[PDB]
């Protein structure tokens, strides 16, 4: 039986750029790097970067990766990414602040204020089409 | 600013099979579902499934999602997924026990024993090509 998320690994075509983006823009700590990848850490999250050169980027789908952020930091984080001219892939329309941006390989990322608890509560008050709770 | 991983969202072509796999094989608790998706939870991990029928899978790269498990549970877990005919995509060569497997849509998943510290420790003693610590 599984206990939670151990790590997340993303394929990256340009390793230096992906390190500079997650380290500098997003603030992960770089723990180690090597010719074929990097290990970085954001709080308790362990991020692997796996260098993969013919990597074309993801399928045009909704598969994506959301990081946490407290309510009072959200505005400045979004401004900071816009100031760095990071492209957005979707506009917000659900409970809680969300900023949706792309990484250097077009992986789909998200800064979100809220958690599963807050989502359910709100969904309880205003449920999605054909919604059912446990 | 960012605090960790808030949630993971996977596009899935067949919402009930995906829920059956995450809930019944992987041990995620189904917390809600609706027309276009489901919310599930594993410990502190918040997994969203986004119903997407014209989905043809993730492309053929090393992008994958590792879940934690105790040493002592790792054997029974692999045995069970294999008994159910899950497909493996990789043989474990790095530090710690790992079992690499695909979900019904072909998302690469992993059950892993260890963590970033156990790995850095191994890496100091057996460094990858070009390896550099922080
Ligand atoms: Mn999201
Ligand atoms: Mn892995």
Spatial CA neighbour of A35 closest among A23, A54, A59, A52: A52
DSSP state of B23: I
Q: How was this structure determined?
A: X-ray
Spatial CA neighbour of B19 closest among A57, A132, A37: A132
Q: Do B116 and A65 touch (CB under 8 A)?
A: no
A88 is annotated as contributing to ligand binding: no
CB neighbourhood size of B74 (10 A): 17
Question: In angstroms, what is the span from residue B2 Cα to ligand 1's centroid?
Answer: 15
Distance CA B102, CA B96 (A): 19
Question: In angstroms, what is the span from residue A122 Cα to ligand 2's centroid?
Answer: 34
Distance CA B109, CA A85 (A): 32
Task: Name the token pair of B53.
Answer: 């029928």
Distance CA B13, CA A70 (A): 33
Task: Give resolution in angstroms.
Answer: 2.2
Spatial CA neighbour of B8 closest among A59, A10, A40, A131: A10
Chain breaks in chain A (C to N over 2.5 A) after: none
Helix extents (H) in A59-126: 74-83, 116-125
Question: Is residue A127 within 8 Å of B34, Cβ to Cβ?
Answer: yes
Q: Do B62 and A133 touch (CB under 8 A)?
A: no
Distance CA A8, CA A1 (A): 19
List the CATH number of the domain containing B63.
3.10.180.10
Taking phi over 0 as left and psi of -120 to 50 as alpha, with beta for the rest, B49 belongs to beta
Determine the structural domain holding residue B39 and report its residue range: 1-134
B95 is catalytic: no
- For strands A98-102 and A108-112, give the pairing: antiparallel
Task: Name the token pair of B75.
Answer: 């054997």
Laid out side by side, the sheet with A98-102 consists of A88-90, A98-102, A108-112, A64-69, B2-12, B45-51, B37-42, B29-34, A132-133
Distance CA B31, CA B77 (A): 23
Distance CA B28, CA A3 (A): 10
CB neighbourhood size of B101 (10 A): 20
Q: Do A45 and B1 touch (CB under 8 A)?
A: no
Distance, in angstroms, between A43 CA and closest chain B CA? Answer: 5
Residue in B34, B55, B116 nearest the CB of A132 = B34
- Torsion from C-alpha of A121, A122, A128, A133, nearest 10 degrees: 0
Q: How many domains does chain B divide into?
A: 1
């Amino acid at each position: 039986m599984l206990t939670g998320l151990n790590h997340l690994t993303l394929a990256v075509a340009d390793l230096p750029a992906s390190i500079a983006f997650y380290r500098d823009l997003l603030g992960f700590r770089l723990e180690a790097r090597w010719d074929q990848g990097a290990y970085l850490e954001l709080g308790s999250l362990w991020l692997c970067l796996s260098r993969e050169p013919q990597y074309g980027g993801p399928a045009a789908d909704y598969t994506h990766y959301a990081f946490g952020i407290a309510a009072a930091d959200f505005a400045r984080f979004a401004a900071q990414l816009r100031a760095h001219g990071v492209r957005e892939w979707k506009q917000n329309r659900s409970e809680g602040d969300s900023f949706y941006f792309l990484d250097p390989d077009g992986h789909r990322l998200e800064a979100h204020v809220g958690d599963l608890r807050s989502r359910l509560a709100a969904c309880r008050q205003a449920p999605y089409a054909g919604m059912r709770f446990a």
